[PDB]
């Protein structure tokens, strides 16, 4: 669960997550952060 992991990651650290987990869809990560905001 990416979002669950992103709970421990800042919305400005989407690049860090991408580099660590090898994510090419950085926009999906940004959207995931927005989804977390909705769940918040």
UniProtKB/Swiss-Prot annotation:
Function: Key component in the assembly and functioning of vertebrate striated muscles. By providing connections at the level of individual microfilaments, it contributes to the fine balance of forces between the two halves of the sarcomere. The size and extensibility of the cross-links are the main determinants of sarcomere extensibility properties of muscle. In non-muscle cells, seems to play a role in chromosome condensation and chromosome segregation during mitosis. Might link the lamina network to chromatin or nuclear actin, or both during interphase.
Disease: Myopathy, myofibrillar, 9, with early respiratory failure: An autosomal dominant myopathy characterized by adulthood onset of weakness in proximal, distal, axial and respiratory muscles. Pelvic girdle weakness, foot drop and neck weakness are the main symptoms at onset, but ultimately the weakness usually involves the proximal compartment of both upper and lower limbs. Additional features include variable degrees of Achilles tendon contractures, spinal rigidity and muscle hypertrophy. Respiratory involvement often leads to requirement for non-invasive ventilation support. Cardiomyopathy, familial hypertrophic, 9: A hereditary heart disorder characterized by ventricular hypertrophy, which is usually asymmetric and often involves the interventricular septum. The symptoms include dyspnea, syncope, collapse, palpitations, and chest pain. They can be readily provoked by exercise. The disorder has inter- and intrafamilial variability ranging from benign to malignant forms with high risk of cardiac failure and sudden cardiac death.
Residues of the full protein shown: 9505 to 9544 of 34350
Domain comment, as recorded: ZIS1 and ZIS5 regions contain multiple SPXR consensus sites for ERK- and CDK-like protein kinases as well as multiple SP motifs. ZIS1 could adopt a closed conformation which would block the TCAP-binding site. The PEVK region may serve as an entropic spring of a chain of structural folds and may also be an interaction site to other myofilament proteins to form interfilament connectivity in the sarcomere.
Compartment list: Cytoplasm; Nucleus
Record note on modification: Autophosphorylated.
Subunit architecture: Interacts with MYOM1, MYOM2, tropomyosin and myosin. Interacts with actin, primarily via the PEVK domains and with MYPN. Interacts with FHL2, NEB, CRYAB, LMNA/lamin-A and LMNB/lamin-B. Interacts with TCAP/telethonin and/or ANK1 isoform Mu17/ank1.5, via the first two N-terminal immunoglobulin domains. Interacts with TRIM63 and TRIM55, through several domains including immunoglobulin domains 141 and 142. Interacts with ANKRD1, ANKRD2 and ANKRD23, via the region between immunoglobulin domains 77 and 78 and interacts with CAPN3, via immunoglobulin domain 79.
Misc remark: In some isoforms, after the PEVK repeat region there is a long PEVK duplicated region. On account of this region, it has been very difficult to sequence the whole protein. The length of this region (ranging from 183 to 2174 residues), may be a key elastic element of titin.
Name assigned to this protein: Titin
Protein encoded by which gene: TTN
Family membership noted in the UniProt record: Belongs to the protein kinase superfamily. CAMK Ser/Thr protein kinase family.
Tissue localization of expression: Isoforms 3, 7 and 8 are expressed in cardiac muscle. Isoform 4 is expressed in vertebrate skeletal muscle. Isoform 6 is expressed in skeletal muscle (at protein level).
Domain of life: Eukaryota
């Amino acid at each position: 669960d990416i979002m669950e992991l992103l709970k421990n990651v800042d919305p400005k650290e989407y690049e860090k997550y991408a580099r660590m987990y090898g994510i090419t869809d950085f926009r999906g990560l940004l959207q995931a952060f927005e989804l977390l905001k909705q769940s918040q």
